[PDB]
């Protein structure tokens, strides 16, 4: 099922740039596939894989990466599908949310990492656009998020509006092996501004 | 499954008749809750002389065990206007002050801030000097006397002056190209401006700053932190109250 | 020509919440258009359209094992001051107000494996001498039978039953407007599994939402922490 | 040549999409900017007795490092009305003054000015004398007491009284037939009139004159002088501000 | 009959910019008709309809000589606090305000003799690690080729590119709303002349105007000189 975070994406150009805006078509900002990590039996509720978008993986976003890299500002949404590979004998559940302006990260800024959420946060993470990933019912979460930020566009080098939080609510039990967490990310309605110099 | 009541079948639930309205959810309205004076901050007056620093009006990242602190932390982006009430409470003998004018200057988001005493008033030998930026001019200067004052205060409304269309209460990124631990959840200008309280009192007392946020708009709800500790399993917290068994 | 005016005694006082504005000193500022998604205007809406997980012994769930029966697996007294409602959005939002009205919606999500099954009996017990200790006792009350393996999730509404139109948010020693009873969950059957060595227990996550008739009134200031 | 974008041909420039309005240029409006109180001047009170001189209200040729000073020097001819705020700030012990009446007299452009104490008030032996031109009459006299005063001020509006249809802020010629270095950028009556502050305080304190210029009209723009020094080549000036990296 | 009135606490205070007038004491003065040409009502109009010359090393122009190439002839960071914008009308008008929005229009006027010719490449470089040092580097950016001898004057618009709706007039250590990048001018070719002994160098005057979308808000008081 598709969950729209706050609203559907738009292709409107930034109100605050009087310079040419380049609309990256789908064949240019393609789609990228990552393995987020492995969910083990030892990890406990509250543990979360924090995936700011993108910033530590921008370098692995091929085409999109090349274009973004050469320009100063970017406005764009994302289409993400988080999956899990578990058997029908595995028990457990995650909550995967899309958080605007997520922060905690002890300035390991814009790096995909793992942390232990503080209770009132894991209890209430459902207050943000999300989907539960119960191991007895489903294996995927699909979230589509619009561009969001204090201004009409940003510099992805200094700001990551959206960050995906995959959080353990019910620990993994059942067969001894781990459950790999997987994620596909596709930039959506990307618009780019002001070309930067040649890299000499 | 089966849905409604009294057969006790698996998945079946009994009938519930929802209650009628009464209060109309008026009190849980965002802008209603914020349009009132809150005692946020308390601050010291600067002497008329010297090179004072301005105090930035930023009630956003608070930890204060007060209702405005958590409430302002319930959303990701915020927009509202502002009203202030500045009061002045003696911390010494009220008879120390025979006149006690207090100059208040408010500065919009982005205003230049270096001041040094520069405006001289002259009278019968002795003279008085006030700051370059305390003088009445382009931005609002308010002058109130504390001495016989029936309320030793002042108050006025000011608008949202930031350059951002919305103030980020939380920001996953840096407000400056140099990524210093400092500029982290930052973004310049995510506030209401700054004030400068200046007076021959300065010692003798302090202020009391209250903010009122008319026209508040909140965006993207966030988790609300607890306020009290967790009671024991299967119990209830028990607080002193108006009601309580005598 | 000068107008005869009489100064009220409460004259030069402060009064923090006056329904009126102060004088403006920095006019004519047109503010930039703030597009931005997800604006909310009333906290009750986000409380109703959203769920939080309870705090059962510090975890967001209770467990059923292959050894269970009788005793209650989950028990919480119906009061926003209850412990298991601690980390929730609805409980936390409530501390800003003095009184509440309406129902709470609880939904249990069984996260035990697909090879696992169990049945629960969830009861709403009204105020009474002392809370039932076994399910045969509670089953006389309003209850529902949840057979997992029919639906993995189950919603139960704790009703509002009181002679008063609103009850207190801040509870204390039991009064007639303090507590509304108890919510309990029992195991109708213990957890069964395809192999007890692989799956011996299953966890039921419990989440709360404000009911459709839920409301909060009287904003209040925060008291000393406790 | 070629005009718009991306072929890189000689004379060709790339596309620019102009920004939408927001603020509507309201703040750069001449009369809006001038209709506010400015702390221009500070002045001494004259004793009730003697032959005092009147102070001319001429804020035009200023060098003051203040926003009204440069701003008034941005046009060649000016017209506006006037509002005043006169305050009084002690420079001694506030208990020196037990009554402290202050007589203010405003004079239209062209008014005669010689005064000497001439109006006697009598009471129980002792008597008090005030100036010939301080008495209430043809032109406005304002009388305020400084003693218990909650604001030790007064204020009123006055119109443009000059005989010139417009005040020349700059004048390439002489205001008198005798061409004395003195009457050079001159022209008689290029001002708002004059005031006379008179009081038994006089020592004990001074005033604070604020001008407000409602209905301002400016003619023929002129160059605007810098305000700050020139930074080094290819650099930027860096000022303390609200925003600034913490 | 006397009206019940309550005195607000901010009662006898001053507040300099109140949106209201004082009491008039010298009524009925009809003012003479003021014909007089050239009245202006908004400073932004004179800023847009007028140009000033920049201050490049204290002169209103940069030079090209018969020996030039690579290096930038003119470089200024896009901020109203920039040095080369120093003596200008737009920069000076700006000090009265806290924030600005919009573009700046620069026009270069080649004043080298008619027997002289050269070509320039003018680029707008967005915020970056460090500013290009040669033209082959900058030419990747927004740029225009000015061949003198086609038009002796050339207008270039420095755009507004920022996530914020307004930027700061008063700059400081680089922030996200302080600086918008750099404006550079390079010599695509060195000055050629009919006789290098007679004309060895030519000067390009550089003037600035407020762009069509330029605006200024928030009047501010002057701080200590620096």
Author numbering:
A (entry chain BA): 31 to 230
B (entry chain AA), D (entry chain AD): 1 to 246
C (entry chain CA), E (entry chain CD): 1 to 226
Report text from the authors:
Equine rhinitis A virus (ERAV) is closely related to FMDV. The generalized picornavirus capsid is built from 60 copies of each of four structural proteins (VP1 to VP4), which are produced by cleavage of a single polyprotein by viral proteases (for a review, see reference 16). VP1 to VP3 each comprise an eight-stranded beta sandwich and form the three quasi-equivalent conformers required to build a capsid with a pseudo-T=3 surface lattice.
The expanded structure thus illustrates both the limits of structural plasticity in such capsids and a plausible route by which genomic RNA might exit. Unsurprisingly, such large movements completely change the interacting surfaces between all adjacent pentamers, disrupting a large interface with complementary electrostatic interactions in the process. The pores in the expanded capsid are the obvious route by which RNA could leave.
